[PDB]
Amino acid sequence: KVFGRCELAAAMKRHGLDNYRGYSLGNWVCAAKFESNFNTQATNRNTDGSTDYGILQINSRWWCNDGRTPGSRNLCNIPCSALLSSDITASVNCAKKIVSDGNGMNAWVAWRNRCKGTDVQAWIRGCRL
Ligand SMILES: [Cl-]
Numbered sequence: 001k002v003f004g005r006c007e008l009a010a011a012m013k014r015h016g017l018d019n020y021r022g023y024s025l026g027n028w029v030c031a032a033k034f035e036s037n038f039n040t041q042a043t044n045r046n047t048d049g050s051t052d053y054g055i056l057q058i059n060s061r062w063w064c065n066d067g068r069t070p071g072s073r074n075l076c077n078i079p080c081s082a083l084l085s086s087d088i089t090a091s092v093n094c095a096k097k098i099v100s101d102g103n104g105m106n107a108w109v110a111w112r113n114r115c116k117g118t119d120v121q122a123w124i125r126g127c128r129l
């Protein structure tokens with residue numbers, strides 16, 4: 001599923017991400033935009049052979065199991081394939097655990113490089129929430 005900007009904002013708000021750990025909704029929408037272009041089916045392989053999955057490009061190195069990242073962890077205790085669903089619940093629950101682990105949203109390289117210190121509120125402008 002390729003979300004619309006406001007559709008995703010509403011879905012994220014409903015799942016508890018607005019101001020989660022102090023991160024306003026615009027941050028999450030911005031991150032999703034540049035990580036996956038709002039596509040729940042986005043996958044990308046890293047050089048170390050791990051793979052990023054779904055709307056927020058969660059990494060198999062630490063967070064999910066894909067059966068092919070030897071010596072990795074599964075901290076969200078889910079198959080990585082569950083992160084590709086049109087239902088974003090699993091991606092959101094896992095993201096809450098990542099953003100809580102001490103490094104905040106800096107765990108998402110595109111957020112750090114493309115959202116952080118910008119006017120993220122513009123990403124939810126005009127949306128009915
Ligand atoms: Cl933080």
Ligand code: NA
Pocket residue numbers: 060061062063064065066069072073074
């Ligand atoms: Na893993």
